[model samples]
Target: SGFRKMAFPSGKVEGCMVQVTCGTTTLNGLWLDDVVYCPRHVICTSEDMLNPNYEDLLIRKSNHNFLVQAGNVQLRVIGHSMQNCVLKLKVDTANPKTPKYKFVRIQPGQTFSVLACYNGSPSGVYQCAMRPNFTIKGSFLNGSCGSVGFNIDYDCVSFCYMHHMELPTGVHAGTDLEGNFYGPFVDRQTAQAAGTDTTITVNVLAWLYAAVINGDRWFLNRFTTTLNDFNLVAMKYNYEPLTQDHVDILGPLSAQTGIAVLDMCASLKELLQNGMNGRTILGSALLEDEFTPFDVVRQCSGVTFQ
Candidate 1:
């Protein structure tokens, strides 16, 4: 703070005005217009002290030139303080007075939304003080008022679909009046043996195919721990010996659930047939019986059985 003078013009005095324009000189590079002051009063007594002194109002020329109108037009003041005694703005209106595109005068709180035409390159820089400490850096990049837009009603959703399939268990053929029924393998073998040896055409259907189709109805009771181990537990328990009460309990239930007591019996029968031959399939592999009974119980009743 050398405590010298205020640099811009103010309305503190009467008939203090200035006009500025952009000209082809080094001092007016940015083609900016600043406040210039002219003191119409002289200071005779310290008490009658005229405020803005003329010497302090000289405008610092830029690297470019400026064109200014001479007259008593009240000029817009920028960056002025009470301490500055005088402010003078300089301009270089070239000879023949072609009125080069002068810098547009912008006052405090003034807003411009339109473009201004100028000479030479139709492009130049402008520096203006809008507030005490704040400055405005102007540009003509995209013409006058720039374009802008905003988002309104936004909506987004995410969903997942899981796939599930239903399949059945084993099939059965009724016994003859003699109480002797075709066993599954023998029925298939009979059907095949008849094809080669019989003079009568035998169009017998395979019991294995029927068994497989019916096997689809077999309920696959699947279960796993949080560990994701897919060990099955137990299959649907089918009591054997076919007592009146056991038959009563399982018969309608199997029919109703599409789960057949015969299939369970057939599974047991197959195990019995192949087990001693060392050709038995594991219960876990065929029926998935390692850990599933617990899940069946849990899902059905939320309880674990011994």
Candidate 2:
């Protein structure tokens, strides 16, 4: 450790706070911001940390596990010396200063919250690290000590909504339920406004219009992960089923993508009959199982599609 300190601003000092990080080694007494001194905080929710009186509020709040609203954050640290644990938080402000973190002593299972005006982008990257060498009082059957174990019941103590959507290109485009087309081929002005999914409406992409109707996020996740992976993963391999078991394999083969598959299939059948959304006349193209599922879907056959 080539220890050499120049100066500081009043009650501020630049030095390594924690020797090691969450799971990475450090340069022994390294005072890097995201390394040890301020071990990187995580965002807990989409709420804003605009609470001015956070300390007093935590002492009085009954409920305390969310992001959109300022609330108490509870943590549990298991390690050598549980008595000597601290939380490092950085105030996300415009001031570009060196020692940009505030420290606080914390207990093994105590409650605390950040005290700052979070106008920053995608808030909270707070860190909780125990002292270099400490002892704990727990009957455990694991490895050695010295290393710290951290878990926050609420997980996030900061709040912010951060998004960085990429501009879809080529055929990375689709039509929404409303017939609005979104793609990279838009004019320059539309491109400027095309940051979030809502701008180009990624979630509203064609077939998704019907699937998202029931609004089951669980189903939404299972299916969307498959649809997105098609573009993000690959094409024309011997088989995609060989890779991660997604819809291509699951829906048509083993495991079956889910009720969500019909979530996509049923909606197409809806369009197959009295078409709405941008799905219009493509109904004829949608074939059926021609088996037990016919009674439920035969409505598509009798519809007046003239």
Candidate 3:
């Protein structure tokens, strides 16, 4: 029902172009990449459909899910316009057969106030798929081809979606990083206090990128080693009284979901060795990485380190 709106390119390496063709008589068919598909089921639009100007609109549509603002557009059939035109909302991924939407119909003279909310999942473009059955008897009587357009509400939709989880607030101890000694100290005290208790406790620690090798098995070993050494040295020097193995090191500590301490240490060493020049290791490729000496401590829970 209005002038043609040219859909610009989205920055993505792959995208679809939505072209609205006005026919004095009737819509013949639609061709995408020279192949004619059901026009009534597939439509394309950029993700940035709601910018202050056309450029922002183009960008949003290209980057995100296309949500149509129903208020700004007129969905109606007047004159000789096609009454059975289907306005299909779709998302175009790399494949054409996988269009996001199919066969959405709009009524004539309908004033839609709220825009259509996308499913929040990634999808393709918005296009009008002409119904083949009604192809023979077209035109809304005004002697003009009828069309529908959608406006997107940019403010309401969020640009980002983060994963859901209950993350700890403080930095993880035993990270070997200079930030906090709190975590290690806590780990030690809690383990000792546990005193042979069989409860499973979690130690959340930050893992360096490298220790991911062997599925983080090595990191776990090294951390346990360091914990044991720390306790033994403390006992030998009389810094601490008698210490129990299960409570102090192996038995006291329970596994956490994320990276293990040995993994963290290995990752840290890998990071150091990678960055520092002239670093040398004499043993197995696995043994090359070592944890920084454990001294500082932070909050700890779980096993008894008596």
Candidate 4:
């Protein structure tokens, strides 16, 4: 062990901090903003002190268990010391810096679930670590005590929504169900002049037309299931399904526009069956599922899309 005087920060010394590292041997001691005076007697660069190899902090699978589902991931704290610990689980794609995390407080034996749709990839890398709840004299330390890392592979093709829709704010600027934001009109006259409501109606019809034609059974199942739920709630209040109305609207639109929904549906079915360009159609439809016509109707009829 060697001690040496090194250049320190010019500001008044507020307090001291310590960092310990293990390379060939254990190096431990006190450090300030820039310099560390230790038994090793070496002046450390800022990068050297700030960047600790996180690979060393990796824990084994025995410490935790995880299950990947269609659209989410579930994690369980299995380690004894890890119980009742405040932890943060971060999910990210290939980019490591930008990630979404879910914080949870786990009891001795408990499980938690987190959404896995950070960057739209079917699978993502995840890391869970205990948060340092204790503080040291005006400073924090030992935050990354124990950590676990894993990858989740989920059903991306079927579960990914094209885009998320923002709910309407007010009369002047209301967001259409298709995730489009309409402007701040001077008044109802200007709003109608902008054709905001008409645009929303057209977008909704287009969404339904595309879904009825190009969507696969899996996609259709999600739509119909959600529709069924909507209808059930409607029936409770003496309302009914618009199944016939959908057919009637599409029939006239097809007759006049020469874009037969049945013909388009047949073509889509054939293309999807051939496996030549099914993914293209599926991906295209997936982009519109977030705010479909059903979403519009539900909102208009005072119903919620399940």
Scored by lDDT, the top model is: 4
* Root mean square deviation (Cα) for candidate 1: 42.3
Task: Give one digit per residue, the lDDT tens place, for model 2 in 133-164.
Answer: 11111221211111122212222111111111
- Give the runs in model 1 whose Cα sits over 4 Å from its true position: 1-240, 251-257, 276-306
Q: What is the lDDT for 94 in model 3?
A: 26
Looking at candidate 2, what is the lDDT of residue 192?
29
- lDDT of all predictions: 0.22, 0.22, 0.22, 0.25
Error of 3 at 59 (Å): 19
Query: Any runs in candidate 4 off by more than 4 Å, and if so which?
Result: 1-245, 252-256, 276-306
Q: Predict model 4's lDDT versus the native.
A: 0.25
For candidate 1, write residues 204-288 as lDDT tens digits. 0111112223343232223212111111111212211222333343443344345454444444444333442433222222322
lDDT of 3 by residue, 1-306 (tens): 111111212111011222222221122122122222212211222221122232232232321222221223311221111112222333232224222222222221111111111211112222111111111111122111112122112212111101111113211111111111111122121221111111111111211222232133333333333545443433432222223432334222223334444444333334323432333222223232111111001112111111
Worst 10 residues of 3 by lDDT: 158-167
Residue 132's lDDT within candidate 2 is: 14
Cα deviation of 214, candidate 1, in Å: 16
Query: What is the TM-score of candidate 3?
Result: 0.17
Better model by lDDT: candidate 1 vs candidate 2: 1
Global Cα lDDT for candidate 2 = 0.22
The lowest-lDDT stretch of 10 consecutive residues in candidate 2 is 1-10
TM-score of 2: 0.18
Regions more than 4 Å wrong, model 3: 1-275, 278-306
Clashing pairs in 4: 162-287
